[PDB]
A paper describes a structure:
[name] is a bacterium that preys upon a wide range of other Gram-negative bacteria, entering their periplasm and consuming them from within. Structural studies reveal a variety of domain usages (and therefore binding capabilities) at the fibre C-termini, placing these on intertwined trimeric β-prisms. Using independent but complementary approaches, we identified and characterized a MAT superfamily of trimeric fibre proteins with diverse adhesive tips, able to fulfil the long-sought-after role of multiplicity of molecular recognition and handling of diverse epitopes (across a wide prey range), by the bacterial predator [name].
The fold has many structural homologues, the closest being snake venom agkisacucetin (PDB code 1v4l28, 2.1 Å RMSD). The largest pockets and clefts are upwardly facing (distal to the fibre base) akin to Mtd. We found that [name]–mCherry did locate to the CpoBBd0635-containing vesicle, deposited during predatory invasion, while Bd1334–mCherry and Bd2734–mCherry fluorescence were diffuse throughout the [name] cell. However, a slight reduction in prey entry efficiency was seen for deletion mutants of Bd2734 and [name], which are structurally divergent but have similar expression profiles and are encoded at nearby genetic loci.
Author numbering:
A (entry chain A): 519 to 627
B (entry chain C), C (entry chain B): 517 to 627
Write the structure that this text describes.
Amino acid sequence: PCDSGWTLINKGDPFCAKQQSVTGTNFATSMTQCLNNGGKLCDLQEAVGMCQTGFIPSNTTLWISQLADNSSAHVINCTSGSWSAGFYGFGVTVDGSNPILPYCCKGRR
Amino acid sequence: SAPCDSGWTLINKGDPFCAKQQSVTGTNFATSMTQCLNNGGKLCDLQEAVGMCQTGFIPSNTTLWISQLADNSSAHVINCTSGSWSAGFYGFGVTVDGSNPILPYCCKGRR
Amino acid sequence: SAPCDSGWTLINKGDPFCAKQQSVTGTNFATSMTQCLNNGGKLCDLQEAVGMCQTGFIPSNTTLWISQLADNSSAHVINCTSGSWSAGFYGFGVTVDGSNPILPYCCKGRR
């Protein structure tokens, strides 16, 4: 159901996700990279589903698609299956001990 | 040739989608989302709730979670009354909006 | 077959999706959402607007609503100029962003 390099996440309506980088990347760069790879930054529920599946490693922070304000965006941290929310300015690349990784999601093919 | 899974209902607003009421009891945000994800769907976003209210699939005077955070600790709810909608927000652990219970509704794509 | 319906354009950015400018004059948030819902779609989200700007579908110096709320009374807008985007927020009844009319854009899934 997913293109080469993507993974079928079986939560909600199953979708396809991919960790796009191992480097800490800012918000706009994350979104643009994912858009160039035929996908989008995952929303809140897709992040929660990937965390519940174990697809996202424990204690990992990623940018989700929601804005916190005109100059900030929300991050989701995944640890031991549970999710927590935060936000940062568009230019931030490191959420405490975790570099903020870009994760792309897209529909089933 | 059914447009939805059994237990789900086609809402003809925007691109028609499939909605289902998960529970009749007030439920917090995290449990709402987890139950929707475990029922093959996800929490309805703002426009899906507006469509379900305009169609009448959501009865008058109904408060339900939507899939947008209000801050790191809160999420938005939508109240539906007399065919019109209004937005509010509440902490994750909250299960009640005034006299109304915050009910979980799930949405997914038309099949 | 055709990826989009008559009037809608396939946007080749992110998950490729069908889009349509719903009006040429400033429209408030609620009327924008209602027009989109009544014409088979919904207000585009943040990444859909960013893609439409990066592909050139959105002309330069264009402000449009998106589907996210900034609070219970306001919604976010995206302005596209050159290849780049910026985020603002305005009350539901606002029609103009500075000297830019707030235009409604509808988005939906392909095929």
